[PDB]
Amino acid sequence: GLLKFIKWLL
Ligand SMILES: CCCCCCCCCCCCOP(=O)([O-])OCC[N+](C)(C)C
Ligand SMILES: CCCCCCCCCCCCOP(=O)([O-])OCC[N+](C)(C)C
Ligand SMILES: CCCCCCCCCCCCOP(=O)([O-])OCC[N+](C)(C)C
Ligand SMILES: CCCCCCCCCCCCOP(=O)([O-])OCC[N+](C)(C)C
Ligand SMILES: CCCCCCCCCCCCOP(=O)([O-])OCC[N+](C)(C)C
Ligand SMILES: CCCCCCCCCCCCOP(=O)([O-])OCC[N+](C)(C)C
Ligand SMILES: CCCCCCCCCCCCOP(=O)([O-])OCC[N+](C)(C)C
Ligand SMILES: CCCCCCCCCCCCOP(=O)([O-])OCC[N+](C)(C)C
Ligand SMILES: CCCCCCCCCCCCOP(=O)([O-])OCC[N+](C)(C)C
Ligand SMILES: CCCCCCCCCCCCOP(=O)([O-])OCC[N+](C)(C)C
C-alpha cells in the first residue's frame, strides 16, 4: 500500500 500514491505524487 501507500507507495502507489507516492508514485503518482512523484
Ligand atoms: C504519530 C502516530 C503515533 C502512533 C498512533 C497509533 C497508530 C497505529 C496504526 C496501526 C494501523 C494498522 O493498520 P492495519 O491493521 O495493518 O490496517 C491496514 C490493513 N490493510 C493493509 C489490509 C489495508
Ligand atoms: C506526521 C507524524 C508521522 C509519524 C510516523 C511514525 C511512523 C512509525 C513507523 C514504525 C515502523 C512500522 O513499520 P512496518 O509497519 O512494519 O512497515 C513495513 C510495512 N509492510 C510490511 C506492510 C511493508
Ligand atoms: C494510503 C494508505 C492508507 C492506510 C490507512 C490505514 C488505516 C488503519 C486504521 C486502523 C484503525 C483500527 O483502530 P480503531 O478500532 O479505530 O482503534 C481505536 C481508535 N481510538 C482509540 C481513537 C478510539
Ligand atoms: C498514511 C496513513 C497510515 C495509517 C496511520 C494510522 C491511522 C489510524 C486512524 C484511526 C482513527 C480512529 O479514530 P476514531 O475516533 O475511532 O475515528 C473513527 C473514524 N471512522 C468511523 C471514519 C473510521
Ligand atoms: C520528517 C522526517 C521524515 C523521515 C522519513 C523516514 C523514511 C523511512 C523509510 C523507511 C522505508 C522502509 O522500507 P521497507 O519496509 O524495507 O520497504 C519495503 C518496500 N516494499 C514493500 C515495496 C518491498
Ligand atoms: C505531517 C505529515 C508528514 C508526512 C511525511 C511523510 C514522509 C514520507 C517519506 C517516505 C520515504 C520513503 O523512502 P524509501 O524509498 O522507501 O526509503 C528506503 C530507501 N531505499 C529505497 C534506498 C532502500
Ligand atoms: C493516528 C495517525 C493520524 C491519522 C492519519 C489518517 C490517514 C488515513 C489516510 C487514508 C487514505 C485513503 O485514501 P482514499 O481516500 O481512498 O484515496 C483517494 C482514492 N481516489 C483518488 C480514487 C479517490
Ligand atoms: C503539510 C504536510 C506535507 C507532507 C509532504 C510529505 C511528502 C513525502 C514525499 C516522499 C517522496 C519519496 O521519494 P522516493 O520514493 O525516495 O522517490 C524516488 C524517486 N525516483 C524513483 C525518481 C528516484
Ligand atoms: C496536514 C496538512 C494536510 C494538507 C493537505 C493538502 C491537500 C491538497 C493537495 C493538492 C495537491 C495537488 O497536486 P496535483 O497538481 O494534482 O499533483 C499532480 C502531481 N503530478 C504532476 C506529479 C502527477
Ligand atoms: C515544494 C513544491 C510543492 C508543490 C509541487 C506542485 C506540483 C509541480 C509539478 C510536479 C513536479 C515533480 O517534481 P519531481 O519529479 O518529484 O521533482 C524532483 C526534483 N529533484 C530530483 C531535483 C528533487
Which experimental technique did the depositors report for determining this structure?
NMR
- List alpha helices for the chain, DSSP H: 3-9
Q: Could you give the 3-state DSSP secondary structure of residue 10?
A: coil
Q: Could you give the 3-state DSSP secondary structure of residue 2?
A: coil
Q: Is the beta carbon of 3 within 6 A of some atom in ligand 8?
A: no
Q: Which three cell numbers stand for residue 1?
A: 500500500
Interruptions in the chain after residues (C–N over 2.5 Å): none
CA distance 1 to 5: 8
> How far is the centre of ligand 3, averaged over its atoms, from the C-alpha of 8 (Å)?
24
CA distance 10 to 2: 13
Phi, psi of 4 (to 5 degrees): -65, -35
Residue nearest to atom 8 of ligand 8 (CA): 6
> How far is the centre of ligand 4, averaged over its atoms, from the C-alpha of 6 (Å)?
20
CA distance 1 to 4: 7
Residue type, 8: W
Closest ligand 3 atom to residue 1 Cα is: 2
Phi, psi of 7 (to 5 degrees): -65, -35
